[PDB]
Design a protein around this ligand. Structure first.
Ligand SMILES: *[C@@H]1O[C@H](CO)[C@@H](O)[C@H](O)[C@H]1NC(C)=O
Ligand SMILES: *[C@@H]1O[C@H](CO)[C@@H](O)[C@H](O)[C@H]1NC(C)=O
Lengths: 49, 49
């Protein structure tokens, strides 16, 4: 994927590896080496006028 | 079965008139929509992400 990664306050249960949006897109992940939960935010976009 | 309203026989005759001896000032609301939320979609980013 492509995006911005940050820490998150999402209270994952220990069996959950990632979180999904209404659009089915993954929007948070557990890091596989250090087990912190990251929020994924899309890279900023918009029209140019 | 729904009711359409109460019945009223108007007291008609060829020489009877009813005239108002008083009045009420009425204030009544009317609400009209004027706009939508201005939405934009990039079709290429919706379809192809
Ligand atoms: C290796 O990754 C696991 C999680 O998959 C973690 O528990 C462990 O602490 C990691 N080891 C090191 C040395 O970072
Ligand atoms: C007209 O109505 C008001 C109340 O709305 C009342 O105080 C007043 O006395 C009435 N006038 C007459 C001529 O009946």
């Amino acid at each position: 994927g492509t995006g911005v990664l940050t820490e998150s306050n999402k209270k994952f249960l220990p069996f959950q590896q990632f979180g999904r949006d209404i659009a089915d897109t993954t929007d948070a992940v557990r890091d596989p080496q250090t087990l912190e939960i990251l929020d994924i935010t899309p890279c900023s976009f918009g029209g140019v006028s | 079965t729904m009711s359409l309203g109460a019945e009223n026989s108007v007291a008609y005759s060829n020489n009877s008139i009813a005239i108002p001896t008083n009045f009420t000032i009425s204030v009544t609301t009317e609400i009209l929509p004027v706009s939508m939320t201005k939405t934009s979609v990039d079709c290429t980013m919706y379809i192809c992400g």
